[PDB]
């Protein structure tokens, strides 16, 4: 288990997301589904020139899995997945620019719902989650668990849980007052409103 500090701008973004009063929290789901769809586009594209990239699983899809016992909502995709270097360095590097632009736009009169336009939509998870665990597997790399409760740090470890083939699972440990996102009716409402034209099947598991 290695512990890392977020780069300063991402820590700042996460605190803004956690601290700002903003009632329209439901947009976290559209952002994470859009991230999954982007990951799925990438593996689909890559497989056109290299068919063996789909040996780790041919099906391209998204599952949404609520668990009231654990108070988690899990978004699973079989997209391209993330490497160790993604988790520790690259994602944070790419996001440094988008954070700055987003934070400047918010001063200009934009709102938190537009986070996705700046390539940092993942961090909207913290509108609803006290902790986020990300399990991910890229071809030719090992499976990793990334985890953060914000507070300026995150951890990465080699994951020895259930092997997943290829892709990413984002596990949102929901805040005590956000359990509405475990309800079938609520998730269905949100997917229909914001994520109706995603080009991959989205399966909403029932409890
Ligand atoms: N599902 C998924 N798949 C990816 C993905 C796949 C390949 C390359 C980059 C990627 N970035 C993100 C969005 C993201 C951003 C920061 C993160 C994160 C996911 O997980 C931990 O920190 N995601 N999210």
Curated annotation (Swiss-Prot):
Belongs to the heat shock protein 90 family. The modification N6-acetyllysine is found at residues 42, 68. The keyword Coiled coil does not apply. It comes from the Eukaryota. The TPR repeat-binding motif mediates interaction with TPR repeat-containing proteins like the co-chaperone STUB1. Its main location: nucleus. Residues 1-207 are annotated as: Interaction with NR3C1. Homodimer. Identified in NR3C1/GCR steroid receptor-chaperone complexes formed at least by NR3C1, HSP90AA1 and a variety of proteins containing TPR repeats such as FKBP4, FKBP5, PPID, PPP5C or STIP1. Forms a complex containing HSP90AA1, TSC1 and TSC2; TSC1 is required to recruit TCS2 to the complex. The closed form interacts (via the middle domain and TPR repeat-binding motif) with co-chaperone TSC1 (via C-terminus). Interacts with TOM34. Interacts with TERT; the interaction, together with PTGES3, is required for correct assembly and stabilization of the TERT holoenzyme complex. One of its GO terms (cellular component) is cell surface. It comes from Homo sapiens. This is Heat shock protein HSP 90-alpha. ISGylated. GO terms for molecular function: ATP binding; ATP hydrolysis activity; ATP-dependent protein folding chaperone; CTP binding; dATP binding; disordered domain specific binding; DNA polymerase binding; enzyme-substrate adaptor activity. One of its GO terms (biological process) is protein folding. Molecular chaperone that promotes the maturation, structural maintenance and proper regulation of specific target proteins involved for instance in cell cycle control and signal transduction. Undergoes a functional cycle that is linked to its ATPase activity which is essential for its chaperone activity. This cycle probably induces conformational changes in the client proteins, thereby causing their activation. Interacts dynamically with various co-chaperones that modulate its substrate recognition, ATPase cycle and chaperone function. The chain holds residues 17 to 223 of 732 of the full protein. It is found in: Nucleus; Cytoplasm; Melanosome; Cell membrane. ATP binds at residues 35, 77, 96, 122. Keywords: Acetylation, ATP-binding, Cell membrane, Chaperone, Cytoplasm, Host-virus interaction, Hydrolase, Membrane, Mitochondrion, Nucleotide-binding, Nucleus, Phosphoprotein, S-nitrosylation, Stress response, Ubl conjugation. Changing residue 77 to A: Impaired ATP-binding. Strong interaction with HIF1A, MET, KEAP1 and RHOBTB2. Loss of interaction with HSF1 and ERBB2. Los of interaction with TSC1.
């Amino acid at each position: 288990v290695e512990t890392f500090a977020f780069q300063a701008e991402i820590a700042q973004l996460m605190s803004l997301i956690i601290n700002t009063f903003y009632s329209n929290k439901e947009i976290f789901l559209r952002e994470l589904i859009s991230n999954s769809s982007d990951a799925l586009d990438k593996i689909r594209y890559e497989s056109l020139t290299d068919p063996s990239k789909l040996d780790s699983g041919k099906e391209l899809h998204i599952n949404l899995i609520p668990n009231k016992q654990d108070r988690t909502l899990t978004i699973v995709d079989t997209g391209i997945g993330m490497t160790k270097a993604d988790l520790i360095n690259n994602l944070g590097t790419i996001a440094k620019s988008g954070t700055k632009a987003f934070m400047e736009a918010l001063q200009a009169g934009a709102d938190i719902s537009m986070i996705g336009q700046f390539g940092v939509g993942f961090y909207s998870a913290y509108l609803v989650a006290e902790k986020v665990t990300v399990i991910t597997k890229h071809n030719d790399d090992e499976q990793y668990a990334w985890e953060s409760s914000a507070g300026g740090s995150f951890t990465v470890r080699t994951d020895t849980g259930e092997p997943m083939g290829r892709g990413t699972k984002v596990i949102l440990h929901l805040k005590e007052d956000q359990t509405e996102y475990l309800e079938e009716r609520r998730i269905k409402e949100i997917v229909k409103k914001h994520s109706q034209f995603i080009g991959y099947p989205i399966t909403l598991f029932v409890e």
